[PDB]
Short mmCIF file of C-alpha atoms and ligand atoms in Angstrom, two decimals:
data_model
loop_
_atom_site.label_atom_id
_atom_site.label_comp_id
_atom_site.label_asym_id
_atom_site.label_seq_id
_atom_site.Cartn_x
_atom_site.Cartn_y
_atom_site.Cartn_z
CA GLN Z 1 -20.53 -26.32 49.83
CA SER Z 2 -19.93 -26.19 53.87
CA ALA Z 3 -17.42 -23.40 54.97
CA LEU Z 4 -15.30 -26.16 56.70
CA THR Z 5 -14.46 -29.53 55.25
CA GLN Z 6 -15.01 -32.64 56.89
CA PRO Z 7 -15.17 -36.34 55.45
CA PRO Z 8 -18.64 -37.46 54.66
CA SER Z 9 -18.21 -40.67 56.69
CA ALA Z 10 -16.01 -42.93 58.78
CA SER Z 11 -16.60 -46.31 60.41
CA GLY Z 12 -15.26 -48.84 62.62
CA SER Z 13 -16.03 -51.85 64.79
CA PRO Z 14 -16.76 -51.90 68.39
CA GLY Z 15 -13.51 -51.20 70.50
CA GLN Z 16 -11.62 -49.66 67.47
CA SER Z 17 -10.59 -45.87 67.03
CA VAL Z 18 -11.77 -43.25 64.45
CA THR Z 19 -10.16 -39.82 63.71
CA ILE Z 20 -12.34 -37.48 61.58
CA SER Z 21 -10.78 -34.20 60.25
CA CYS Z 22 -12.17 -30.63 59.97
CA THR Z 23 -10.09 -28.45 57.65
CA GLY Z 24 -10.57 -24.78 57.20
CA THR Z 25 -8.25 -21.59 56.32
CA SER Z 26 -5.74 -19.87 58.24
CA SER Z 27 -8.54 -17.26 59.03
CA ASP Z 28 -10.65 -19.99 60.73
CA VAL Z 29 -9.39 -23.11 61.83
CA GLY Z 30 -6.03 -21.93 61.85
CA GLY Z 31 -6.44 -18.37 63.24
CA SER Z 32 -7.20 -19.40 66.92
CA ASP Z 33 -8.09 -22.28 69.17
CA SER Z 34 -11.78 -22.22 68.77
CA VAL Z 35 -12.80 -25.29 67.33
CA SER Z 36 -15.68 -27.18 68.60
CA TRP Z 37 -17.30 -30.60 67.94
CA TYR Z 38 -20.87 -31.55 68.02
CA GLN Z 39 -22.50 -35.07 68.14
CA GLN Z 40 -26.01 -35.67 66.89
CA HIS Z 41 -28.01 -38.95 67.12
CA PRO Z 42 -30.26 -38.44 63.99
CA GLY Z 43 -33.82 -36.90 65.04
CA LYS Z 44 -32.29 -35.85 68.36
CA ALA Z 45 -31.01 -32.59 69.90
CA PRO Z 46 -27.12 -32.26 69.48
CA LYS Z 47 -24.49 -32.15 72.00
CA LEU Z 48 -21.43 -30.18 72.44
CA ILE Z 49 -18.50 -32.62 73.14
CA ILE Z 50 -15.42 -30.58 72.33
CA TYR Z 51 -14.78 -26.90 72.63
CA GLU Z 52 -11.51 -24.87 72.15
CA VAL Z 53 -10.10 -27.59 70.16
CA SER Z 54 -9.51 -29.99 73.08
CA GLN Z 55 -11.71 -29.05 76.08
CA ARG Z 56 -14.28 -31.90 77.15
CA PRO Z 57 -17.78 -30.62 78.87
CA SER Z 58 -18.63 -32.30 81.87
CA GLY Z 59 -19.89 -35.95 81.27
CA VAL Z 60 -18.12 -36.44 78.04
CA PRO Z 61 -15.59 -39.41 78.48
CA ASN Z 62 -12.09 -39.08 77.58
CA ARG Z 63 -12.49 -41.51 74.76
CA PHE Z 64 -13.11 -38.35 72.85
CA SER Z 65 -10.16 -36.21 72.23
CA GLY Z 66 -9.74 -33.03 70.08
CA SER Z 67 -6.45 -31.66 68.47
CA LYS Z 68 -5.41 -29.25 65.93
CA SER Z 69 -2.47 -29.03 63.34
CA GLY Z 70 -2.39 -26.03 61.11
CA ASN Z 71 -5.69 -25.45 59.32
CA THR Z 72 -7.03 -29.32 60.20
CA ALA Z 73 -8.66 -29.88 63.57
CA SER Z 74 -9.28 -33.51 64.31
CA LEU Z 75 -11.66 -35.56 66.63
CA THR Z 76 -10.64 -38.99 67.80
CA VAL Z 77 -13.10 -41.35 69.32
CA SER Z 78 -11.05 -44.32 70.91
CA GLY Z 79 -12.63 -47.55 71.67
CA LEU Z 80 -16.04 -47.08 69.78
CA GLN Z 81 -19.22 -47.99 71.83
CA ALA Z 82 -22.41 -48.37 70.16
CA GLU Z 83 -23.79 -45.07 71.52
CA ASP Z 84 -21.06 -43.28 69.28
CA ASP Z 85 -22.76 -44.16 66.27
CA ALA Z 86 -23.79 -40.77 65.31
CA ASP Z 87 -23.26 -37.47 63.11
CA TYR Z 88 -20.37 -35.35 64.07
CA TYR Z 89 -20.04 -31.68 63.15
CA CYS Z 90 -17.33 -29.08 63.78
CA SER Z 91 -17.20 -25.43 64.10
CA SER Z 92 -14.70 -22.61 64.41
CA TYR Z 93 -14.43 -18.90 64.76
CA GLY Z 94 -13.81 -17.10 61.45
CA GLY Z 95 -12.19 -13.86 60.90
CA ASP Z 96 -14.52 -11.49 62.70
CA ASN Z 97 -17.55 -12.49 64.89
CA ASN Z 98 -18.43 -15.16 62.20
CA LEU Z 99 -19.02 -18.95 63.09
CA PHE Z 100 -18.28 -21.34 60.31
CA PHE Z 101 -19.47 -25.14 60.28
CA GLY Z 102 -18.27 -28.23 58.77
CA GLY Z 103 -20.65 -30.44 56.69
CA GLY Z 104 -20.75 -33.34 59.32
CA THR Z 105 -19.40 -36.58 59.37
CA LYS Z 106 -21.48 -40.02 59.54
CA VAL Z 107 -19.63 -42.40 62.17
CA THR Z 108 -20.98 -45.83 61.87
CA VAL Z 109 -20.28 -48.38 64.36
CA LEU Z 110 -20.20 -51.29 61.77
CA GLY Z 111 -23.30 -53.54 62.37
CA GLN Z 112 -22.66 -55.91 59.75
CA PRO Z 113 -19.77 -56.53 57.19
CA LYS Z 114 -18.92 -53.60 54.82
CA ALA Z 115 -20.35 -53.83 51.33
CA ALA Z 116 -19.35 -51.46 48.32
CA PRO Z 117 -22.44 -50.06 46.29
CA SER Z 118 -23.33 -51.65 42.89
CA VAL Z 119 -23.45 -48.55 40.69
CA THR Z 120 -25.68 -48.64 37.63
CA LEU Z 121 -26.21 -45.41 35.46
CA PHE Z 122 -29.06 -45.16 33.09
CA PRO Z 123 -29.20 -42.82 30.07
CA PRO Z 124 -32.44 -41.29 28.88
CA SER Z 125 -35.19 -43.64 27.84
CA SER Z 126 -36.92 -43.39 24.56
CA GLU Z 127 -40.20 -42.29 26.11
CA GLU Z 128 -39.24 -39.35 28.36
CA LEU Z 129 -37.04 -38.05 25.45
CA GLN Z 130 -40.24 -38.10 23.25
CA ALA Z 131 -41.60 -36.11 26.22
CA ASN Z 132 -38.86 -33.49 26.17
CA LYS Z 133 -37.02 -34.85 29.28
CA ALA Z 134 -33.70 -36.33 29.32
CA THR Z 135 -33.46 -37.58 33.06
CA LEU Z 136 -30.54 -39.64 34.14
CA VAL Z 137 -30.81 -42.05 36.84
CA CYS Z 138 -27.85 -43.38 38.90
CA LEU Z 139 -28.90 -46.60 40.63
CA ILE Z 140 -26.82 -47.37 43.97
CA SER Z 141 -27.63 -50.74 45.72
CA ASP Z 142 -26.41 -53.43 48.26
CA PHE Z 143 -23.80 -51.11 50.45
CA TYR Z 144 -23.27 -50.72 53.93
CA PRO Z 145 -22.87 -48.75 55.84
CA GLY Z 146 -25.95 -46.60 54.59
CA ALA Z 147 -23.83 -43.46 53.99
CA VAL Z 148 -23.36 -42.41 50.42
CA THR Z 149 -22.24 -38.97 48.55
CA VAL Z 150 -22.90 -38.62 44.87
CA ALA Z 151 -21.63 -36.24 42.50
CA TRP Z 152 -22.46 -35.61 38.82
CA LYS Z 153 -20.25 -34.25 36.09
CA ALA Z 154 -21.27 -32.62 32.79
CA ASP Z 155 -18.21 -33.53 30.55
CA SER Z 156 -15.77 -32.86 33.24
CA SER Z 157 -17.36 -29.90 34.89
CA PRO Z 158 -19.43 -30.35 38.49
CA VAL Z 159 -23.17 -29.91 37.98
CA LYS Z 160 -25.11 -28.84 41.01
CA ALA Z 161 -28.54 -27.79 39.47
CA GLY Z 162 -31.18 -30.55 38.58
CA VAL Z 163 -29.35 -33.33 41.12
CA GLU Z 164 -31.74 -35.14 43.60
CA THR Z 165 -30.48 -38.26 45.74
CA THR Z 166 -32.82 -40.14 47.77
CA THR Z 167 -32.14 -41.04 51.46
CA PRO Z 168 -30.60 -44.45 51.56
CA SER Z 169 -33.20 -47.15 52.90
CA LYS Z 170 -32.39 -50.69 53.94
CA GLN Z 171 -33.77 -53.12 51.52
CA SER Z 172 -34.84 -56.93 51.88
CA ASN Z 173 -31.35 -58.25 52.04
CA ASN Z 174 -30.50 -55.65 54.74
CA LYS Z 175 -28.23 -53.66 52.57
CA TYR Z 176 -28.93 -50.07 51.46
CA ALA Z 177 -30.12 -48.79 48.36
CA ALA Z 178 -30.57 -45.31 46.86
CA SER Z 179 -31.05 -43.44 43.50
CA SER Z 180 -29.50 -40.04 42.27
CA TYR Z 181 -31.17 -38.62 39.23
CA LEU Z 182 -30.19 -35.60 37.06
CA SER Z 183 -33.19 -33.74 35.23
CA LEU Z 184 -31.46 -32.57 32.18
CA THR Z 185 -33.31 -31.01 29.05
CA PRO Z 186 -32.91 -33.02 25.77
CA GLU Z 187 -30.79 -30.11 24.70
CA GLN Z 188 -28.31 -30.34 27.69
CA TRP Z 189 -28.29 -34.06 27.13
CA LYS Z 190 -27.50 -34.01 23.34
CA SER Z 191 -25.09 -31.23 23.61
CA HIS Z 192 -22.48 -32.54 25.95
CA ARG Z 193 -19.86 -35.18 25.41
CA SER Z 194 -21.28 -37.21 28.25
CA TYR Z 195 -22.45 -37.16 31.82
CA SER Z 196 -21.00 -39.02 34.91
CA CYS Z 197 -22.14 -40.37 38.06
CA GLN Z 198 -19.49 -40.23 40.98
CA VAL Z 199 -20.55 -42.54 44.11
CA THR Z 200 -18.34 -42.32 47.14
CA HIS Z 201 -18.63 -44.92 49.92
CA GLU Z 202 -16.13 -45.54 52.78
CA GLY Z 203 -13.78 -43.17 51.49
CA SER Z 204 -13.65 -44.64 47.95
CA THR Z 205 -15.22 -43.21 44.78
CA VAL Z 206 -16.66 -45.00 41.94
CA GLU Z 207 -17.40 -43.35 38.52
CA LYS Z 208 -19.83 -44.34 35.74
CA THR Z 209 -20.41 -42.37 32.50
CA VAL Z 210 -23.10 -42.41 29.92
CA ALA Z 211 -23.21 -40.60 26.44
CA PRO Z 212 -26.00 -39.98 23.81
CA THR Z 213 -26.34 -42.67 20.81
CA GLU Z 214 -28.13 -42.38 17.64
CA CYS Z 215 -30.75 -44.61 18.46
CA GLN U 1 -26.11 -31.55 80.14
CA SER U 2 -29.63 -30.06 81.04
CA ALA U 3 -31.77 -29.25 78.04
CA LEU U 4 -33.47 -26.17 76.99
CA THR U 5 -37.25 -26.44 76.88
CA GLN U 6 -39.17 -26.51 73.54
CA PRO U 7 -42.44 -27.86 72.85
CA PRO U 8 -42.35 -31.12 70.83
CA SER U 9 -44.60 -29.97 68.08
CA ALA U 10 -46.11 -26.97 66.33
CA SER U 11 -48.04 -26.46 63.07
CA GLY U 12 -49.70 -23.94 60.55
CA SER U 13 -51.10 -23.91 57.05
CA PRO U 14 -49.43 -22.32 54.18
CA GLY U 15 -49.09 -18.82 54.50
CA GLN U 16 -49.75 -18.89 58.06
CA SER U 17 -47.33 -17.94 61.17
CA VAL U 18 -46.14 -20.30 63.72
CA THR U 19 -44.15 -19.17 66.73
CA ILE U 20 -42.13 -21.57 69.05
CA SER U 21 -40.53 -20.93 72.21
CA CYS U 22 -37.20 -21.89 74.05
CA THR U 23 -37.21 -21.51 77.63
CA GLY U 24 -34.05 -21.50 79.59
CA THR U 25 -32.61 -19.96 82.77
CA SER U 26 -31.11 -16.76 83.82
CA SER U 27 -27.62 -18.24 83.30
CA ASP U 28 -28.13 -19.32 79.78
CA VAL U 29 -31.04 -17.72 77.61
CA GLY U 30 -31.39 -15.08 80.25
CA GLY U 31 -27.67 -14.38 80.60
CA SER U 32 -26.88 -13.06 77.50
CA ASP U 33 -27.98 -12.56 73.79
CA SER U 34 -26.22 -15.83 72.60
CA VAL U 35 -29.39 -17.62 71.52
CA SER U 36 -29.44 -19.47 68.26
CA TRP U 37 -32.10 -21.23 66.10
CA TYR U 38 -31.28 -24.03 63.55
CA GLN U 39 -33.39 -25.63 60.92
CA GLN U 40 -33.16 -29.30 60.26
CA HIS U 41 -34.80 -31.48 57.51
CA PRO U 42 -34.95 -35.12 58.28
CA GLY U 43 -31.68 -36.95 57.08
CA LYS U 44 -30.07 -33.74 56.23
CA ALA U 45 -27.32 -31.30 57.91
CA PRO U 46 -29.01 -28.78 59.80
CA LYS U 47 -28.93 -24.86 58.92
CA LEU U 48 -28.39 -22.11 61.40
CA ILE U 49 -31.13 -19.61 60.79
CA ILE U 50 -30.90 -17.21 63.57
CA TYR U 51 -27.92 -16.20 65.89
CA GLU U 52 -27.39 -13.61 68.77
CA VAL U 53 -31.18 -13.96 69.56
CA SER U 54 -32.57 -12.07 66.29
CA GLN U 55 -29.59 -12.02 63.52
CA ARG U 56 -30.34 -13.75 60.20
CA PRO U 57 -27.26 -15.49 58.38
CA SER U 58 -26.90 -14.62 54.57
CA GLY U 59 -29.35 -16.28 52.61
CA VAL U 60 -31.93 -16.87 55.25
CA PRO U 61 -35.37 -15.31 54.33
CA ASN U 62 -36.77 -12.42 56.56
CA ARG U 63 -39.70 -14.69 57.24
CA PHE U 64 -37.75 -16.06 60.16
CA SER U 65 -37.59 -13.64 63.05
CA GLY U 66 -36.27 -14.25 66.72
CA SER U 67 -36.56 -12.33 69.78
CA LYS U 68 -36.17 -12.99 73.75
CA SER U 69 -37.99 -12.04 76.90
CA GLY U 70 -36.57 -12.90 80.08
CA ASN U 71 -35.61 -16.62 80.17
CA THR U 72 -37.68 -17.52 76.91
CA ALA U 73 -36.60 -17.20 73.36
CA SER U 74 -39.05 -17.16 70.44
CA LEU U 75 -38.94 -17.97 66.74
CA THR U 76 -41.64 -16.77 64.62
CA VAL U 77 -41.89 -18.29 60.87
CA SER U 78 -44.39 -16.14 58.99
CA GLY U 79 -45.52 -16.92 55.44
CA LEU U 80 -45.31 -20.58 56.02
CA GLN U 81 -44.05 -22.54 53.17
CA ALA U 82 -43.81 -26.47 52.62
CA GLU U 83 -39.78 -26.04 52.68
CA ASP U 84 -40.44 -24.81 56.47
CA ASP U 85 -41.74 -28.34 57.66
CA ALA U 86 -38.81 -29.55 59.71
CA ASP U 87 -37.03 -29.77 63.01
CA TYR U 88 -36.19 -26.64 64.90
CA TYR U 89 -33.42 -26.52 67.77
CA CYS U 90 -32.55 -23.43 69.88
CA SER U 91 -29.37 -23.35 71.65
CA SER U 92 -27.59 -20.82 74.12
CA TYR U 93 -24.20 -20.30 75.75
CA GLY U 94 -24.19 -20.28 79.44
CA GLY U 95 -21.14 -19.86 81.79
CA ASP U 96 -18.63 -22.39 82.24
CA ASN U 97 -18.06 -22.82 78.33
CA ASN U 98 -21.35 -24.52 78.33
CA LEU U 99 -23.56 -24.79 75.42
CA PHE U 100 -27.42 -25.71 75.94
CA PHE U 101 -29.75 -27.21 73.33
CA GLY U 102 -33.50 -27.50 73.17
CA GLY U 103 -35.14 -30.75 72.51
CA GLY U 104 -36.40 -29.68 69.18
CA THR U 105 -39.58 -28.69 67.75
CA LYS U 106 -41.09 -30.42 64.79
CA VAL U 107 -43.08 -27.68 62.74
CA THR U 108 -45.52 -29.33 60.51
CA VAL U 109 -46.98 -27.36 57.54
CA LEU U 110 -50.47 -28.58 57.15
CA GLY U 111 -52.46 -29.46 54.23
CA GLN U 112 -49.75 -29.54 51.55
CA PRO U 113 -51.19 -30.38 48.25
CA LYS U 114 -51.46 -33.76 46.84
CA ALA U 115 -49.44 -34.81 43.92
CA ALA U 116 -49.43 -37.51 41.46
CA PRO U 117 -45.95 -39.23 40.84
CA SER U 118 -43.83 -38.85 37.62
CA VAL U 119 -42.86 -42.39 36.73
CA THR U 120 -39.94 -42.86 34.31
CA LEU U 121 -38.95 -46.65 33.32
CA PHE U 122 -35.32 -47.24 32.18
CA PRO U 123 -34.34 -50.54 30.41
CA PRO U 124 -30.96 -52.08 30.94
CA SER U 125 -27.96 -49.97 29.85
CA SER U 126 -25.47 -50.96 27.49
CA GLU U 127 -22.71 -51.32 30.16
CA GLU U 128 -24.61 -53.67 32.49
CA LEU U 129 -25.61 -55.92 29.49
CA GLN U 130 -22.01 -56.36 28.87
CA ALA U 131 -21.32 -57.15 32.48
CA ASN U 132 -24.01 -59.92 32.11
CA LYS U 133 -26.68 -57.87 34.13
CA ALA U 134 -29.85 -56.41 33.10
CA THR U 135 -31.45 -54.32 35.96
CA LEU U 136 -34.46 -52.30 35.41
CA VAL U 137 -35.34 -48.99 37.41
CA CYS U 138 -38.47 -47.39 37.75
CA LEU U 139 -37.98 -43.85 38.92
CA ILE U 140 -40.88 -42.24 40.81
CA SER U 141 -40.61 -38.75 41.80
CA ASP U 142 -42.90 -35.55 42.41
CA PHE U 143 -45.57 -37.22 44.44
CA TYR U 144 -47.21 -36.26 47.87
CA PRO U 145 -48.10 -37.77 50.22
CA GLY U 146 -44.79 -39.92 50.36
CA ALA U 147 -46.53 -43.35 50.04
CA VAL U 148 -46.54 -45.61 47.01
CA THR U 149 -47.04 -49.40 46.03
CA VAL U 150 -45.30 -50.75 43.00
CA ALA U 151 -45.97 -54.01 41.05
CA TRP U 152 -43.98 -55.37 37.99
CA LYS U 153 -44.88 -57.45 35.05
CA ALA U 154 -43.20 -59.64 32.63
CA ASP U 155 -45.37 -59.16 29.62
CA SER U 156 -48.60 -59.34 31.02
CA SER U 157 -47.92 -61.57 33.96
CA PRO U 158 -47.05 -60.42 37.43
CA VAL U 159 -43.25 -60.53 38.64
CA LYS U 160 -43.11 -62.00 42.10
CA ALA U 161 -39.42 -61.91 42.73
CA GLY U 162 -36.14 -59.86 42.39
CA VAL U 163 -38.12 -56.52 42.97
CA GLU U 164 -36.92 -53.86 45.53
CA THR U 165 -38.36 -50.52 46.15
CA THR U 166 -36.73 -47.59 48.24
CA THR U 167 -38.23 -46.04 51.02
CA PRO U 168 -39.59 -42.49 49.73
CA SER U 169 -37.68 -39.67 50.75
CA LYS U 170 -38.54 -35.94 50.39
CA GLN U 171 -36.45 -34.01 47.82
CA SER U 172 -35.72 -30.32 47.18
CA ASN U 173 -39.18 -29.68 45.84
CA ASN U 174 -40.66 -30.80 49.07
CA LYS U 175 -42.03 -33.84 47.21
CA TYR U 176 -41.04 -37.32 47.59
CA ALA U 177 -38.96 -39.47 45.43
CA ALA U 178 -38.28 -43.29 45.07
CA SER U 179 -36.74 -45.96 42.83
CA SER U 180 -38.11 -49.56 42.07
CA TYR U 181 -35.39 -51.68 40.69
CA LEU U 182 -35.96 -55.09 39.02
CA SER U 183 -32.83 -57.49 38.55
CA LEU U 184 -33.03 -59.65 35.66
CA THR U 185 -30.70 -61.72 33.89
CA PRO U 186 -29.86 -60.73 30.32
CA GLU U 187 -31.82 -63.81 29.33
CA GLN U 188 -34.88 -62.89 31.12
CA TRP U 189 -35.06 -59.41 29.65
CA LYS U 190 -34.27 -60.78 25.95
CA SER U 191 -36.98 -63.71 26.32
CA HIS U 192 -39.96 -61.43 27.05
CA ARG U 193 -41.86 -58.97 24.91
CA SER U 194 -41.71 -56.23 27.43
CA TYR U 195 -41.56 -55.24 31.15
CA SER U 196 -43.85 -52.89 32.95
CA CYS U 197 -43.78 -50.96 36.15
CA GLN U 198 -47.16 -50.20 38.08
CA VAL U 199 -46.92 -47.38 40.60
CA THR U 200 -50.06 -46.87 42.67
CA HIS U 201 -50.42 -43.47 44.71
CA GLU U 202 -53.52 -42.67 46.34
CA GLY U 203 -55.67 -45.03 44.49
CA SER U 204 -54.31 -44.05 41.22
CA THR U 205 -51.97 -46.18 39.00
CA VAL U 206 -49.62 -45.19 36.62
CA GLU U 207 -48.00 -47.84 34.25
CA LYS U 208 -44.96 -47.72 32.05
CA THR U 209 -43.72 -50.30 29.61
CA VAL U 210 -40.24 -51.15 28.04
CA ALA U 211 -39.26 -53.60 25.65
CA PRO U 212 -35.81 -54.87 24.31
CA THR U 213 -34.08 -52.25 22.14
CA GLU U 214 -34.30 -52.49 18.53
CA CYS U 215 -30.94 -50.51 18.01
CA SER U 216 -27.23 -51.50 17.10
C1 LIG K 1 -23.32 -27.75 58.20
C2 LIG K 1 -23.75 -27.15 59.07
C3 LIG K 1 -23.99 -27.49 60.62
C4 LIG K 1 -24.50 -26.78 61.56
O1 LIG K 1 -24.55 -27.39 62.83
C5 LIG K 1 -24.86 -26.59 64.03
C6 LIG K 1 -25.14 -27.60 65.17
C7 LIG K 1 -24.95 -26.71 66.47
C8 LIG K 1 -26.16 -28.52 65.17
C9 LIG K 1 -25.90 -29.74 64.74
C10 LIG K 1 -27.18 -30.65 64.84
C11 LIG K 1 -28.14 -30.29 65.03
C12 LIG K 1 -28.42 -28.77 64.96
C13 LIG K 1 -27.40 -28.03 65.09
C14 LIG K 1 -24.99 -25.36 61.29
C15 LIG K 1 -24.96 -25.13 59.91
O2 LIG K 1 -25.38 -23.77 59.74
N1 LIG K 1 -24.52 -25.90 59.08
C16 LIG K 1 -24.44 -25.29 57.54
C17 LIG K 1 -23.24 -24.65 57.25
O3 LIG K 1 -23.48 -23.80 55.83
C18 LIG K 1 -22.52 -23.15 55.74
O4 LIG K 1 -21.18 -23.52 55.97
N2 LIG K 1 -22.70 -22.11 54.77
C19 LIG K 1 -21.93 -21.32 53.99
C20 LIG K 1 -21.41 -20.05 54.86
C21 LIG K 1 -20.42 -19.54 54.35
C22 LIG K 1 -19.78 -18.34 55.27
C23 LIG K 1 -20.53 -17.87 56.27
C24 LIG K 1 -21.78 -18.62 56.60
C25 LIG K 1 -22.43 -18.25 57.83
C26 LIG K 1 -22.37 -17.17 58.44
N3 LIG K 1 -23.15 -17.03 59.44
C27 LIG K 1 -23.81 -18.43 59.51
N4 LIG K 1 -23.44 -19.02 58.34
C28 LIG K 1 -22.19 -19.54 55.72
#
């Protein structure tokens, strides 16, 4: 969706190192040395931390380093500190006077053990079907860090319209939970082989699939 | 490191206009026409809506207009809509390869309409019952303001344990969504006549009930 591609998330414990990538094309990332990186603590103003691939503004510690190889730029944060937990965005000049941005990378400094999500995909309930709705819901619970990306497939084809995913919230067990729901019509639901929920967490994807049944 | 100066807060009613300012110095905002504005909904990536003081990227409505006078840039959002409720940041390049950002302005769209939740209750799926699990999910969507309370029933008796409800989050229709889910064993699910989800929003309660399926 974003012009430049960044991994959705990275994580590490205090003192560890983490590298996050920013992939474009030869006409942006690979067409000059104009890659910048920005840091944002959620709800706060962002801050430029790297410009022209490798240059650190004043005040930015040398724990942060930027490099580029071909059409991929990389930001390395060595010796993670608590204040490095933030969202990180890249940008690059394009072909002509155009500025391209990546989708952002959530960098977590692990505050607790990592936990993969429990993924449960529910087909349409009877009551909503007889109200001419065929909403599917994909329940995602008990994960840490609280970053997740969800993709839906109709058969094998990506489906963007009708998808809603809730912002992960921390539950009573101190692990995160969210739900993605796909608002189908009964016709859409009954006319496909199946639908799938793809849940990505800590660089690993899990997929669940449901299909219509007679009863 | 120094910031541009934006008011913390601004507001307006639907259809009204709102103007927010971004005050810099002669060597940033006043130094050239490199002022940008970004819109960001909480928990989402931001969206550049203005660059070079006044230029809108593709797909940005012409309700958003940017200008500059001296050291102060201004964004005006006319015809306010619920989706304009968000944080707005300005930026400006200076010399020395510097990029300055304002602290951000939270624009509030006042008096958005109340909306009762849609409630959809799902019984355990085939796959999880196979896996010796019986989680129920109560999907709650399309409600405003974003506060709900959820109670569960086993037959007619209150369910006091195994309940989790997510913090409501605003979705693409500018209304809130949440899920309550009840972790049951397959035995609990099968031993009862039904389970119900009771969602209370603004003093009004919606109740849904599901029972072990009679299919095969
Ligand atoms: C993801 C993201 C980040 C971003 O952070 C800025 C950072 C300072 C910041 C950070 C935190 C808080 C505030 C600001 C800005 C931003 O706009 N995005 C969305 C990117 O959208 C696209 O790539 N869309 C397709 C696309 C395709 C081709 C051209 C364009 C185009 C032309 N002219 C403008 N866009 C767009």
